[PDB]
């Protein structure tokens, strides 16, 4: 579940709010954007 790790530090304010709403560990979300950026689609795909 949620932790303030390095993936959370690097994420954008949208993704940090999404991750904290849904209890997501962003270290386990694979970012598909430029330079590995974690997108909102990545987080929504991960919840299911």
């Amino acid at each position: 579940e949620f932790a303030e790790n390095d993936a959370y530090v690097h994420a954008t304010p949208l993704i940090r709010r999404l991750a904290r709403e849904f209890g997501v560990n962003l270290a386990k979300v694979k970012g598909t954007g430029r330079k590995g950026r974690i997108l909102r689609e990545d987080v929504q795909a991960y919840v299911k």
């Binding site: 530090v9 690097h10 994420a11 954008t12 304010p13 709010r17 904290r20 709403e21 330079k35 950026r37």
Partner: protein, 470 residues
């Protein structure tokens, strides 16, 4: 005895408080504001950020008008009428406070005027113009702010010993005025009164004004104000005495004058403390710490689950924009949204001449926390915009993680430097690296292009400067 029931009562109507109340209302919550003064807006609007920016704008124009003389545009010496200046400062404030009262009415947020104190976990008692109001609440948001620190050996009662509120009343222009403390508030008021005719002295106990800000940034600012003010670093006031010819301040320290100096006025601007001890918050079960802060978690919630606290009263930094955003989150949580207040960065601006502005990590903080970092700097001596506006001593600085090249902080010293913080703040929040910044085309000629050019220095592509990274 009037009695009221509400879903949310907000204690205090400064930027944190009224933003909270207005967010609550927009989210459909029944909301009441308690405020002891007769207008909304708290310290920032009435006796703080807004009146001081208004006077600093007058000060800036006066200085720009004189700088033009060497250029061939010669204005005559400005005839000053401090009563009209005051009346204009007051007009600015009243326009904003009326607009706040109007938005409170449009949102149907009731305003109860008077001093509020908790009497139970769900009860707030107000003592005001209309007698006592008893307010029964489902939720409370404490937003009661802070207050100027006073020193005890100081005869603060004397009408020539000022706090920030006194200085912003603009009752007179003292011939010789002392500023105690090299904080932002003190330097801003010294900037104002100098433009109006005062000789300004500043006594600061540490080795630099604005101690949080980096040394290379403050070196530039100090070089400038060291001609306008007499600045006493590593110096402390050891006693103050009020006589009929002026206030006598005896100092001990490096620059401390031998003999007690005479001043027409003394502004005490040595910091502010939170108001958390003055609410009987303990009667509601709310924990208040030894320093008078009400500590909260990242949902702005106190140890009592239905009572929140926001703004100056929960801790440093004591700034209006922090309070506003905390107020939104607190209202959102109460309304049932799983939201948190966890910004990467919070910007700070000193609206002095030149401005000093920074966001994210400083070099000091990066060194303490052990981050491996690298700085990139763009000097304004190479900016056509800055030269053509007579601000060529400025500087733009970015701070990057050495390994990842992500930006983690930045700082500007210069005329209009504060306005550049928006880009740097966003850059950190978005996780930009130096390449992302350098490759974005910035408008030329501008001051803010120095942010892209600083990134180009780090990237080793800069061509408006020598490039030691070629």
């Amino acid at each position: 005895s009037t009695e009221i029931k509400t879903q949310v009562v907000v204690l205090g109507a400064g930027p944190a408080g009224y933003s909270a109340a207005f967010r609550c209302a927009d989210l459909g919550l029944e909301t009441v504001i308690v405020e002891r003064y007769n207008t909304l807006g708290g310290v920032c609007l009435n006796v703080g950020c807004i009146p001081s920016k208004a006077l600093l704008h007058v000060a800036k124009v006066i200085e720009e008008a004189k700088a033009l003389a060497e250029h061939g545009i010669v204005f005559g010496e400005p005839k000053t009428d401090i009563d009209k200046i005051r009346t204009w400062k007051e007009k600015v404030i009243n326009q904003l406070t009326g607009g706040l009262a109007g938005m409170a009415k449009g949102r149907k947020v009731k305003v109860v005027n008077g001093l509020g104190k908790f009497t139970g976990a769900n009860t707030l008692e107000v003592e005001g113009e209309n007698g006592k109001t008893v307010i029964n609440f489902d939720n409370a948001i404490i937003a009661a702010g802070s207050r100027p620190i006073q020193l005890p050996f100081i005869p603060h009662e004397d009408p020539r010993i000022w706090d920030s509120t006194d200085a912003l009343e603009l009752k007179e222009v003292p011939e010789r005025l002392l500023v105690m403390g090299g904080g932002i508030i003190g330097l801003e008021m010294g900037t104002v009164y100098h433009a109006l005719g005062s000789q300004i002295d500043v006594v600061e106990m540490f080795d630099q004004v604005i101690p949080a800000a980096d040394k290379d940034i403050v070196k530039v600012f100090t070089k400038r104000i060291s001609k306008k003010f007499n600045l006493m670093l590593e110096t402390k006031v050891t006693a103050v005495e009020a006589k009929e010819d002026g206030i006598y301040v005896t100092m001990e320290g490096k620059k401390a004058p031998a003999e007690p100096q005479r001043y027409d006025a003394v502004l005490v601007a040595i910091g502010r403390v939170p108001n958390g001890k003055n609410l009987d918050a303990g009667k509601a079960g709310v924990e208040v710490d030894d320093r008078g802060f009400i500590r909260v978690d990242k949902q702005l919630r106190t140890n009592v689950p239905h009572i929140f606290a926001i703004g100056d009263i929960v801790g440093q930094p004591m700034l209006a924009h922090k309070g506003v955003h905390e107020g939104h989150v607190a209202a959102e949580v109460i309304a049932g949204k799983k939201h948190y207040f966890d910004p990467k960065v919070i910007p700070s601006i000193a609206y002095t001449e030149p401005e000093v502005a920074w966001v994210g990590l400083t070099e000091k903080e990066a060194k303490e926390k052990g981050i491996s970092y690298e700085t990139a700097t763009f000097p304004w001596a190479a900016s056509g915009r800055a030269i053509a506006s007579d601000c060529a001593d400025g500087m733009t600085k970015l701070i990057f993680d050495k390994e990842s090249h992500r930006v983690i902080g930045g700082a500007i010293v210069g005329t209009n430097g504060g306005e550049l913080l928006g880009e740097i703040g966003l850059a950190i929040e978005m996780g930009c690296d130096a390449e992302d910044i350098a490759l974005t085309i910035h408008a030329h000629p501008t001051l803010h292009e120095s942010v892209g050019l600083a990134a180009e220095v780090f990237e080793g592509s800069i061509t408006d400067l020598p490039n030691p990274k070629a």
